[PDB]
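Narrative progress, year one. The postdoctoral researcher (J.K.) led the effort to move from monomer predictions toward full complexes, under supervision of the PI. The following entry was the first complex the group processed end to end, covering 756 residues in total.
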Amino acid sequence: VRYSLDPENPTKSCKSRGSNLRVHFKNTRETAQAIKGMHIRKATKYLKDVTLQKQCVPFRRYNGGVGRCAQAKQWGWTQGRWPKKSAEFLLHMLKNAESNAELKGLDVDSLVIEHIQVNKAPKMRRRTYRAHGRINPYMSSPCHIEMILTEKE
Amino acid sequence: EVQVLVLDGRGHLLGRLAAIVAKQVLLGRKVVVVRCEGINISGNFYRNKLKYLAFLRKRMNTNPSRGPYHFRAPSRIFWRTVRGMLPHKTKRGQAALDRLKVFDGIPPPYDKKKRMVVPAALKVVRLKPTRKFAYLGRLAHEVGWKYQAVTATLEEKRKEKAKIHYRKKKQLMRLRKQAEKNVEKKIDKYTEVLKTHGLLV
Amino acid sequence: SHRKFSAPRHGSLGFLPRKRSSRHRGKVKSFPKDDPSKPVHLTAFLGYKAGMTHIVREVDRPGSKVNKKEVVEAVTIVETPPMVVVGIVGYVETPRGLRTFKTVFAEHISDECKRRFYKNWHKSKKKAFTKYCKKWQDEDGKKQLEKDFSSMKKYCQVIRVIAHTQMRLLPLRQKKAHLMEIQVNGGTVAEKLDWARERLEQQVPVNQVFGQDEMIDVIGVTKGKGYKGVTSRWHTKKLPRKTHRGLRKVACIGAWHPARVAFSVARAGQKGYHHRTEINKKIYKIGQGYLIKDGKLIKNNASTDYDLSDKSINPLGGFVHYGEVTNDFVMLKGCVVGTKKRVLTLRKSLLVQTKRRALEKIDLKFIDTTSKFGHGRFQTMEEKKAFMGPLKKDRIAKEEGA
RNA sequence: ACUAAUCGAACCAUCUAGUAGCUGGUUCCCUCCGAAGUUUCCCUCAGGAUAGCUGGCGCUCUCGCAGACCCGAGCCACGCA
RNA sequence: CUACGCCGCGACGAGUAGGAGGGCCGCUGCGGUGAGCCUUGAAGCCUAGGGCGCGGGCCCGGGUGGAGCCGCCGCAGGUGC
RNA sequence: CCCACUGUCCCUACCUACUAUCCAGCGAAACCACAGCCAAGGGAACGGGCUUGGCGGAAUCAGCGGGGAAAGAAGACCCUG
RNA sequence: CACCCACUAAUAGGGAACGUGAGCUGGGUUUAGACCGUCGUGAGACAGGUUAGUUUUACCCUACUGAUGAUGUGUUGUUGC
RNA sequence: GAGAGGCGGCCGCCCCCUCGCCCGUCACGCACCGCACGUUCGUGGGGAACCUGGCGCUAAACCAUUCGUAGACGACCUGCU
Ligand SMILES: [Mg+2]
Ligand SMILES: [Mg+2]
Ligand SMILES: [Mg+2]
Ligand SMILES: [Mg+2]
Ligand SMILES: [Mg+2]
Ligand SMILES: [Mg+2]
Ligand SMILES: [Mg+2]
Ligand SMILES: [Mg+2]
Ligand SMILES: [Mg+2]
Ligand SMILES: [Mg+2]
Ligand SMILES: [Mg+2]
Ligand SMILES: [Mg+2]
Ligand SMILES: [Mg+2]
Ligand SMILES: [Mg+2]
Ligand SMILES: [Mg+2]
Ligand SMILES: [Mg+2]
Ligand SMILES: [Mg+2]
Ligand SMILES: [Mg+2]
Ligand SMILES: [Mg+2]
Ligand SMILES: [Mg+2]
Ligand SMILES: [Mg+2]
Ligand SMILES: [Mg+2]
Ligand SMILES: [Mg+2]
Ligand SMILES: [Mg+2]
């Protein structure tokens, strides 16, 4: 498969991927941007804290109607949320990437998420029923997620 | 010129001085105008007060906090007058506006510097002696300015210190003219050179 | 076209930023005009709204119906423990306003005052003013402090004192003290600096600032009411019952032109918690606070010369939502902005009091101390026990304990 | 009123690509020339025919062409405005 | 001196509706022609690559792609948004 | 019209359930030349853009009904055919 | 509009798309039902009377109301102008 | 010297040169062979990083928890050996 942003050296690097994952693209894009550049141990703790609503992700681009929170002040922002499904999907991808790191023989305590990217998957069509005998789409917005972790300490 | 042009605002007509200043800052020159309360405006005081009170009336009916900003300090009145002569909505006019600084009274950075004068904007030469005029300090004070009194006392203190400095300058020049008599025989060799070339009549 | 019938507008436009106050304490915003002929005195104080009660007094207003008659009047008790002076600020008059020339604090700043400088006193290492207090003892620093006082003596027009409340003497949860600048009036800058310097670290009671039956001004923040609609915020007319989208609204928010909504139209938003000043609040009493000479002296708080009853300003069962008033207090007349235990600024009146309503001596005949936690009907514990006699709880109390 | 969510004449298919002086649209470049809203007639007045204004294709002629270089050697084109 | 070529001199240059000319402008297919191009890489597509033309457009470099395509002389259109 | 009755009103207040609000999950539609601060001017005689001035400070949340001569329908009134 | 009662210091006159319907109401006007008078042969008509008659959408931009924030003084806090 | 002092002045000790100012004597310096951006403020401002000596310092903010003087959510008032 073709990753965007091939690593500067594919020997201190590990890759993880997921296609057609059933999480909201907008939520996962904000969550991925928060953990970008993080250490893998810091990111795992952070994504667990998002599930417990102890640290939020800052909704920076897709922030229409997103409410305010006190935990957005850790970042330089005002709006934040705690997307549980986006955090769990990225936690599984972090686990898969870490197991790939072990298979490549490089230690997992120096890994940093140097690349992460969320693309839009093909939408899945459902149906809703409206007032005057009308039908409107009820589409889902899945996403492809890819990541690259590199050793640096 | 590359230096900073400091102008004394006393006795200067408002728009006459503002026109000269506006062209100066457009030519890349830094201009400082001090004693903006000494600027005069042609026409009797009641006439000029009516002009500014009409300006106070012009405000945004929907939200006056967005409307015209009426600045009551004489420095800010002169600053806004110069702004009306610049293309202040372009980057060139904004840069020119940044080269101009205005002060009520004379602050300590400029009170020890010799102050220039624009003859083309002076009331003595640009106005007939029988015509009435108003003072920008009085006009501003009677329309909302809050610091006519404190600027008055600080200007008196500055003038007291300047008188002392001037009497030291007089004492120095008196000594220098006396010196030119004391060393007269060993100076006339260089004095005759000066006289034949116009300097030192 | 013109509206059919004339009607005054709802709500004053003099309070138009109808927003939550940026401050909780309430700043003075105007001190009384300084005249050097008067003696050196303070102009402000900090108190805490304890509660309300009512009094009985004899009116001495000639020509009125209530002349030589007894009236009752609501009063507000404001607990005012003595302030502690911890610093001096100098100000110099400039053509741009007053600007702080130099601030000199004192040694031994109290812990309660030092909590004001910390958002999190718990995790703090309490390092505030640790190096500043060291220059009050060395040689070069002490000489520098003298230079600061001399330059304040020759360049400053108005000086103020930083004073803080002793929050430890109050029954409140809060321990962090409230700092405030109080302008020193009545004298030359040298004289008021000499006065303010010898009051450093000293306690200034409310006795020295305010006097009996004078009109003062109370500055504070009103009770917050949250977001509110136009009928509660601006008291506009409620629309009829038949209205479709709702009746607690303003029907027209502007004409077609000027094609915008004006700032003068009543709209829904934050109500309450506004910074307000109220002038001409008379001081009916300055209480003495609890003392101990041989026993606990409590009588003088609410014992008028006509009552002669040993009781304090505290109602039966304590002030509701506040606690027990133990320090000095000021008994203002009428209502005062703010909730209970809200910090209030008391300021000398800017005006000149010449009317007969002012400068009228107040002689209290009775101070009500019934329970405000319901329909109280007894003034003291002793009166309640005497009226009702022994109860079952006391009957078994003497049985179990002999 | 109702006659399958259709009724002052249902629905389905065809005649049918019904007709429209009326509305909307009408697809590459450069060069040259370049208007009319006026006359007369029409159940003509939101349209046509007709003359006028426009472009294109020409045709019939006129002044002559000049001296290889250089060098004119009363009279000066049909006709038009 | 491709006489449908080349050269000289003088004056001129607005343009809707509209008319006309030129197009070595462009698309598709047929007849001839290029002892044309092409798996040592066609068409198509992408390109901060080099240019030509007043313009319609065109040529060339690089990448991708994987089997067909183009110039010139005529012919014919379901030929340009 | 009268009696009684009452929050229809003077003159509004408080309370309760469900919402709205914030969050986890899920997730549309209308509409959209470009867009979106004003005063005056002139202009298809009522500008978001143009002239002249006032000025202009990221990203947003809850409301709101002044504007967008807001959206919804090739005006059903009137006239023409 | 008018008129009258009553109080009052006075009960002045007007504009803002004859201000103000995604603010309301729908009494009037101004569809379809119906009655009367007049006109008309009739279908039907009447700035004649009368009665019953669906009032839709804001979550967009701005305006406004509130609410976080943002730029700069190294970070941060207190007191302040 | 406080108006925005962001500056200026006066002494005492020490070490240096009798030079630097004018008119003259005396020769020398890359004299780079006609040529531009030369000359200064200036050791300029701003950002990281390395080496080098001395003097020094050892903190807060936010989240989480709590408060309810606050509150749609943020924010705010608060407490925590
Ligand atoms: Mg929104
Ligand atoms: Mg439905
Ligand atoms: Mg259905
Ligand atoms: Mg009126
Ligand atoms: Mg008013
Ligand atoms: Mg209704
Ligand atoms: Mg009670
Ligand atoms: Mg057809
Ligand atoms: Mg006929
Ligand atoms: Mg037409
Ligand atoms: Mg042309
Ligand atoms: Mg076709
Ligand atoms: Mg406008
Ligand atoms: Mg139509
Ligand atoms: Mg129609
Ligand atoms: Mg109207
Ligand atoms: Mg409207
Ligand atoms: Mg409506
Ligand atoms: Mg009706
Ligand atoms: Mg009807
Ligand atoms: Mg009949
Ligand atoms: Mg009748
Ligand atoms: Mg009915
Ligand atoms: Mg919402």
